[PDB]
Design a protein around this ligand. Structure first.
Ligand SMILES: CN(C(=O)c1cc2c(s1)-c1ccccc1OC2)c1ccccc1Cl
Length: 837
């Protein structure tokens, strides 16, 4: 291995945030096996991709243009302004015209074809055989009444993407020798609980006798289970837990080579913090100095893995079972029906999760029958892709490789635009995989390597978890390395630049962070001190430019140091502004970015992403709620970036121009921020729509009860919530908001009626996607929050979506929710100030 390759691994290590060649916290080679296993998948995808399309990464969709967007196009013509260079002309185009076609109706229309259209000031390209109405940037401009400005330039050199060349029928038993902890900080008793699990299902449980809890407790006792070795399903975990529940650790009973685990193990455990994905991890606690450890012995030898049509009425019970929601509990009777009528079940794709949860994973013969069932998968293969259904099969309830692989099989047909909508959830679902190398992990690798925008985001989503998840950083580091090794030198160089910038901002944040206090900073001393620290960086080691992490198409240049500062909040985040490093930009507007240290931004990324998914759902129903999910990216441990939405203030700040509350303050602000009455009327309309979206969206997620200071509005009428990092009211619809809609005091009016109608329409559009939302919500709680109870926490969403009711009871239910808010007025808002004292 050339000394060159070592310098390179060192580079990857710094991009990753973890050293994948570190073998301090392993007890086998699953991780190395996986690094070698992912070489093939990576190389195959690198060799399959088109160098040109990969270089320009056009962002496209197959979805039809929504009704509400055709409205802005009734002349069947679209005007593209080509600016190359210092000259320019506006060209009318047809929604079906291809970029190369409008280049034909150009070149000849004026009068060398080695050119391409690029969005001004962005690294965004309009290329490939696709109708222009099918480009996201084109739709983004229409939704915002913006003009489409493009520049004619030379295609990027694919050379810049060069990839560096690479080079027994016995019963199961386990002996628990003992446990050891360095320091015990009332003497309690302690015992060990051993479980055999599969898909969060205890097939067998054994306990040791209780013993005095001392720094070292020994048993030397065999725990014999009823399950036979031959019966162990692949992917089963031996879950070991210490009760006084204090600590846990897991060990895959069958390894990545299909071999039964054997030998001595000394496992360092995870301590419970006073149900979640972290509990299923096969990784051990990296902290060997201060953790509990448990020693065991496994002696097990083997090398395993070597015309009844339904009566009319049972069929009704079956269909009833199938229609229930993902959270409905399956009775023993239900499972027996699903299983007995296996072949009937296999004809309803929606039954797949319920049915596979009816399998006795602890019986070799049954698992075998299950694979037989899966063999004739015709119905499933021809079913229309149902994301909600595919995801149910990737959660904690399914440990079977084959069952999860057919889920992944359906994802294979998603277009890039959809992978982007679900990427973050798919990356989180890698946590439910029992092995490091898996079909889902390979799918993320492959889609990332096929596309620059997916790879860019895939990078940050993996780095965010690697930096702050001890339970999964090892598996995610291997996935990230595999991707880094095939994205190409150009991307590699881009990531390096982003990492240096954020690494420098930590240092600045941290040095600044020492001079400070809680609730009020001031310190004209520290701000003068900030500008100096930035000035020092500005010359270098801070790169000329870098891609904005949450808006990769944007290149930030030099800092506009005079506009930078430290924000006045509990945490002392930086408010940075940069010049755009693209001269072709269509403006002089700086790029604002809030960089913050001290908080885990992953809950906010997660929330924002679900908001983006709710928007896409509404799009499929021809609705636009005008939500505003601003960029947010967790970039490292307790640190990350946030987009500064331009021309925006806090709804509280507006009121503060304390504690009393006036209804017209908001309308006055908006009327005053409007250049014309026309713009003011548009702002009023836009507020109504955005207000409705946040009311529906926020209620469903059960994050509707917010303080005025966590809600903002743009001068253009766009309302939007912020800071999602973790009497009552379902959501916020205060008197001032009502006033803008022309109502007050249990009144009504055309905009207000328009509000209720949109809300209702928005609400029921989400109910047609009830299962998708439920599975995203529960996956979110398991993989993003603390130890959340499945039974009660996850059930909230079921009640909110009012599962079990028809449309009429639904409309009524939401309308009442709007009424509760009305009755409450300013009550709730006003009450928070006192909680502080
Ligand atoms: C958590 N947190 C946020 O989530 C923000 C989200 C946005 C912010 S702060 C913001 C501020 C000013 C102008 C535009 C903005 O866009 C959206 C936050 C709150 C207060 C101070 C700093 C931050 Cl990063």
């Amino acid at each position: 291995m050339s000394e060159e390759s070592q310098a390179f691994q060192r580079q990857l290590t710094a991009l990753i945030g973890y050293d994948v060649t570190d073998v301090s916290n392993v007890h086998d080679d699953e991780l190395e096996f996986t690094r070698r296993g992912l070489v093939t998948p990576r190389m195959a995808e690198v060799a399959s991709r088109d160098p040109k399309l990969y270089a320009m990464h056009p962002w496209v969709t197959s979805k039809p243009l929504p009704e509400y967007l055709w409205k802005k196009i009734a002349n069947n013509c679209i005007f593209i302004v080509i600016h190359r260079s210092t000259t320019s002309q506006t060209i009318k185009v047809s929604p079906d015209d291809t970029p190369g076609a409008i280049l034909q109706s150009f070149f000849t229309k004026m009068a060398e074809q080695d050119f391409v259209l690029r969005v001004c000031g962005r690294d965004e390209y309009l290329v490939g055989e696709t109708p222009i109405k099918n480009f996201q940037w084109v739709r983004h401009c229409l939704k915002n009444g913006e003009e489409i400005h493009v520049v004619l330039d030379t295609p990027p050199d694919p050379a810049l993407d060069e990839v560096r060349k690479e080079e027994c029928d016995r019963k199961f038993r386990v002996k628990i020798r003992g446990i050891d902890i360095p320091v015990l900080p009332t003497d309690l008793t302690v015992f060990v609980e051993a479980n055999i699990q599969h898909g969060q299902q205890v097939l067998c449980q054994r306990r040791t006798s209780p013993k005095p809890f001392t720094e070292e407790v020994l048993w030397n006792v065999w725990l014999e289970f009823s399950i036979k070795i031959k019966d162990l399903p692949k992917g089963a975990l031996l879950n070991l837990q210490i009760y006084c529940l204090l600590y846990y650790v897991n060990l895959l009973l069958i390894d990545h080579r299909f071999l039964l685990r054997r030998g001595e193990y000394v496992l360092h455990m995870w301590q419970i913090s006073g149900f979640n994905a972290d509990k299923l991890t096969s990784a051990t606690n990296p902290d060997k100095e201060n953790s509990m450890s448990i020693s065991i012995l496994l002696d097990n030898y083997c090398h395993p893995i070597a015309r009844a049509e339904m009566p009319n009425q049972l069929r009704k019970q079956l269909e009833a079972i199938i229609a229930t929601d993902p959270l409905n509990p399956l009775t023993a009777e239900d499972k027996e029906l699903l299983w007995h009528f296996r072949y009937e079940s296999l004809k309803h794709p929606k039954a797949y999760p319920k049915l596979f949860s009816s399998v006795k994973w602890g019986q070799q013969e049954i698992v075998a029958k299950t694979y037989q069932l899966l063999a004739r998968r015709e119905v499933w293969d021809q079913s229309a892709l149902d994301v909600g259904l595919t995801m149910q099969l990737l959660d904690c309830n399914f440990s079977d490789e084959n069952v999860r692989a057919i889920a992944v099989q359906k994802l294979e047909s998603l277009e890039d635009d959809d992978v982007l909508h679900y990427l973050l959830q798919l990356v989180q679902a890698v946590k439910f995989e029992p092995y490091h190398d898996s079909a889902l992990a390979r799918f993320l690798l492959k889609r990332g390597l096929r596309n620059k925008r997916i790879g860019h985001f895939l990078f940050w989503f993996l780095r965010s978890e690697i930096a702050q998840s001890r339970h999964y950083q090892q598996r995610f580091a291997v996935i990230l390395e595999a991707y880094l090794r095939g994205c190409g030198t150009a991307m590699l160089h881009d990531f390096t630049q982003q990492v240096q910038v954020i690494e420098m901002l930590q240092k600045v944040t941290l040095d600044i962070k020492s001079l400070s206090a809680e609730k009020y900073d001031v310190s004209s001393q520290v701000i003068s001190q900030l500008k100096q620290k930035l000035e020092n960086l500005q010359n270098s080691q801070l790169p000329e430019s870098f891609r904005v992490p949450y808006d990769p198409g944007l290149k930030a240049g030099a800092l506009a140091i005079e506009k930078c500062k430290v924000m006045a909040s509990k945490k002392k985040p930086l408010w940075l502004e940069f010049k755009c490093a693209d001269p072709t930009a269509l403006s002089n507007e700086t790029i604002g970015i809030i960089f913050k240290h001290g908080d885990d931004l992953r809950q906010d990324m997660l929330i924002l992403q679900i908001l983006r998914i709710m928007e896409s759902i509404w799009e499929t129903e021809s609705l636009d709620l005008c939500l505003l999910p601003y960029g947010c990216i967790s970039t490292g441990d307790k640190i990350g970036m946030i987009e500064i939405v331009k021309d925006a203030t806090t709804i509280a700040k507006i009121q503060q121009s304390t504690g009393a509350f006036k209804d017209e303050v908001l309308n006055h602000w908006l009327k005053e921020k409007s250049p014309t009455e026309e713009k003011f009327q548009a702002a009023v309309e836009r507020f109504v729509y955005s207000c409705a979206g946040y009311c529906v969206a926020t209620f469903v997620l059960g994050i509707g009860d917010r303080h005025n200071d966590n809600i903002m509005i743009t001068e253009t009428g766009n309302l939007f919530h912020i800071d999602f990092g973790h009497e009552r009211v379902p959501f916020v619809l205060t008197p001032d908001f009502l006033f803008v809609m022309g109502t007050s005091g249990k009144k009504t009016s055309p905009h207000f009626q328009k509000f209720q109608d949109i809300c209702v329409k928005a609400y029921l559009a989400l109910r047609h996607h009830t299962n998708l939302l439920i599975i995203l919500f529960s996956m979110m709680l398991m993989t993003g929050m603390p130890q959340l109870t499945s039974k009660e926490d996850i059930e909230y969403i079921r009640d909110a979506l009012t599962v079990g009711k028809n449309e009429e009871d639904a409309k009524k239910y939401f309308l009442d929710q709007i009424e509760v808010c009305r009755d409450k007025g300013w009550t709730v808002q006003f009450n928070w100030f006192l909680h502080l004292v």
